[PDB]
């Protein structure tokens, strides 16, 4: 083996993942969503088993299309080379309902996959994941994105500098966006806050909540009431709670 | 090395092995602090023997009432993560009986049962939220994912040792519990959630004692839950395509709660 060999270096560390620019995908319900949404397939790998889905995978996604030992698979029976995007954030549309969510230097690869998750499924447009992060093309995020990652676009922002560009170019085109930042202690309940308006939600870090960079430049900062001094809530958890008082304040009127 | 290790070591792997020893491994000055400030028994306490040794560290081996033994730093990567943090301090602490009367039942009653996870870190983590949001407990239904795994512990960052979890083989031990509490005069309602419930979630009554019962991350609720439950309530998703990770359902869900209680809107 030696392809497969390039193929092990994209599980293990981003810094070969991001010279190849692709990653790897498991499972016939992921690899149809890539497919579904446009992402390019390079590669298709698979093993004697073979599902009905797994079966229609082959005879429908025309590309390179490789067959492997169980042993070497590593417990997926589909595994697919997908093209990663250039990290552009106009992937991300700017409608007059806007919702989307900023995650600020997050340490958790699992905990962006399960925003982007939530995202998804709760109807916001976009995730950005700003500053020195764990990569969204890690396979903890892929695996707990559940596929989502395919239909919501996450775009990768070093700078909160370059985030402030486009937003600002967004409110130059009629759109009126408001940062809105999240803490255990901020200064207006979640519910008390107008989410019908187009919004960025700004998630912080696990261990330090939002930077005090991005705590200057947002126009409020919200919170989920808690019970007591010891409790605090993670970050996937708290974002999808917002991101729901959001979905029932635009349902509710 | 030691045929003591040897059982500290196996309380890592399958959860009978804890059951049947009566304790469970927390790893960490802060979580092992939040056991003794709830009054867990610590059993043995553990540390660095080639020695750091942090205040903190110092503190809980001269505050602790406890049989305490220094260990060479390599034994001590029993877990941590092999990969994040190996722990200074690491306590054997005593596991509770597995009795429901340990969750209080009040009038504002809100529970949470948990029916047969597959991930253990999805159970901390509702442990950390109903605790956070002021659930008076949990339940974790089957033998599947166990409460007391080291990712469920690690992951309810602490919160184990302030919301009192309780384990159950089947709905029919709950049901006996929940009857009882019922004739004593709480009356207690069943609330599955689901994509594809009933009912929204804020169209329901979150202000009457509730028991809210969270599926499985592969299967959703069982069909022997459906059955019991008096109703299904449901976040509305933006497709037919992404659904909730559990936690996170969980979440919204008790904070719906939550901000019916606020009395009003
Ligand atoms: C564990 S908290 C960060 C810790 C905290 N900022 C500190 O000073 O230690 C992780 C993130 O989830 C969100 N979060 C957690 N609890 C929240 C709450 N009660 N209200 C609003 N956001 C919350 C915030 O966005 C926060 O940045
Ligand atoms: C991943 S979901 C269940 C999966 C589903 N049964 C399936 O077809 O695979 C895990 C649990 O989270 C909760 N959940 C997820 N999405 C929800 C939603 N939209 N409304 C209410 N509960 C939800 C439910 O308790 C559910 O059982």
């Known amino acids: 083996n030696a392809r497969f060999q390039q193929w092990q270096a994209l599980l293990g560390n981003r810094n070969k993942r991001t010279r190849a620019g692709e990653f790897l995908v498991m499972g016939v319900r992921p690899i149809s969503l890539a497919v579904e949404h446009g992402w390019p397939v390079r590669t298709l790998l698979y093993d004697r088993e073979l599902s009905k889905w797994a079966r229609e995978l082959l005879r429908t996604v025309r590309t390179e299309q490789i067959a492997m030992a169980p042993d070497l698979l590593m417990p997926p029976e589909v595994v697919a080379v997908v093209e990663m995007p250039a990290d552009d954030l106009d992937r991300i549309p700017v409608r007059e309902?806007?919702?989307?969510?900023?995650?600020?230097?997050?340490?958790?690869?699992?905990?962006?996959?399960?925003?982007?998750?939530?995202?998804?499924?709760?109807?916001?447009?976009?995730?950005?994941?700003?500053?020195?992060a764990a990569?969204?093309?890690?396979?903890?995020?892929?695996?707990?994105?559940?596929?989502?990652?395919?239909?919501?676009?996450?775009?990768?922002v070093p700078s909160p500098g370059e985030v402030?560009?486009?937003?600002?170019?967004?409110?130059?085109?009629?759109?009126?966006?408001?940062?809105?930042?999240?803490?255990?202690?901020?200064?207006?309940?979640?519910?008390?806050?107008?989410?019908?308006?187009?919004t960025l939600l700004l998630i912080g870090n696990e261990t330090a909540g939002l930077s005090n960079?991005?705590?200057?430049?947002?126009?409020?900062?919200?919170?989920?009431?808690?019970?007591?001094?010891?409790?605090?809530?993670?970050?996937?958890?708290?974002?999808?709670?917002?991101?729901?008082?959001?979905?029932?304040?635009?349902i509710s009127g």
């Open 97 to 132: 309902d806007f919702l989307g969510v900023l995650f600020d230097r997050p340490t958790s690869p699992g905990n962006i996959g399960s925003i982007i998750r939530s995202a998804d499924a709760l109807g916001a447009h976009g995730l950005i994941v700003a500053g020195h």
């Open 164 to 198: 402030m560009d486009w937003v600002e170019a967004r409110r130059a085109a009629g759109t009126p966006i408001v940062l809105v930042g999240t803490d255990e202690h901020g200064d207006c309940d979640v519910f008390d806050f107008d989410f019908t308006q187009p």
């Open 213 to 250: 960079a991005w705590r200057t430049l947002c126009d409020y900062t919200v919170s989920i009431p808690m019970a007591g001094s010891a409790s605090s809530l993670n970050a996937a958890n708290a974002a999808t709670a917002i991101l729901y008082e959001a979905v029932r304040q635009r």
């Open 135 to 156: 990569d969204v093309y890690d396979p903890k995020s892929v695996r707990s994105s559940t596929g989502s990652l395919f239909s919501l676009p996450a775009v990768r």
